[PDB]
Structure 1
Amino acid sequence: ADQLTEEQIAEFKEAFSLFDKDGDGTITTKELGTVMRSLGQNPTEAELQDMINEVDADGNGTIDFPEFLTMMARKMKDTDSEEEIREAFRVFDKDGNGYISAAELRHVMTNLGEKLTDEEVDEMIREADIDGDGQVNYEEFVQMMTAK
């Protein structure tokens, strides 16, 4: 229902640099599972190549930036995309306090192999908290996808 613009396009190319630590425009099989080990799952060689061949345009175990935008905009057109957001909420809000707590958000950042301060966490709240409750809800979370 909602379409992305050149502005939203800059966040994607910018979002691609997290999975593309090489700077060539590829998300290799080993880079995707590195994301899998920080999520709390065991990555297998059968799964790694299986996930890639879904978007992989070349077919060598790497995902490119043109078709990466192809996967998100596809299932985002069924409007039943509410079941997919429940997935982002469980990764952020682990104990389901109904919203996203600062204590759990930190662990997600620290589990990625990085060290951040609480001062930055306040920035996420002003960015997603409408009434400024200090935590992130799913309802606001839904609207956060169409935010520029």
Structure 2
Amino acid sequence: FDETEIEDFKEAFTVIDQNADGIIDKDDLRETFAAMGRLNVKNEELDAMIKEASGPINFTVFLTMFGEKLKGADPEDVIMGAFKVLDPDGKGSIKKSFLEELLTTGGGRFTPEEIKNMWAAFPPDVAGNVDYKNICYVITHGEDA
């Protein structure tokens, strides 16, 4: 965890903690979702978020919960560092079959089935290994941009 990433989680903690007391309760979760447009947010969704913690969601409990789910989270500059080492001549997005072979043949984390799941929402270019960069974006901030 770099310090600017921890400051981003402190700003997200303050936007969900609308009572500003330092502990995100279930009312803060529901009023942050209602301010984003969720008028139908069920109480069972709020209870499932609170069921991931052993205590109240203060800043260090929110940081330890996000730490334990993001144990391989990598910032965009280090993902582009590794992709610039995979394309060491610069500019070009690397081939689809080169990333499939190098993921498998180096590591068990790069096994195929997982490579079909990589192509599956990370579209073609991303999946193929030709573009580059959009995948670093969606690994640090999810969903389609």
TM-score (norm 1): 0.43
Larger Cα Rg: Structure 1 or Structure 2? 2
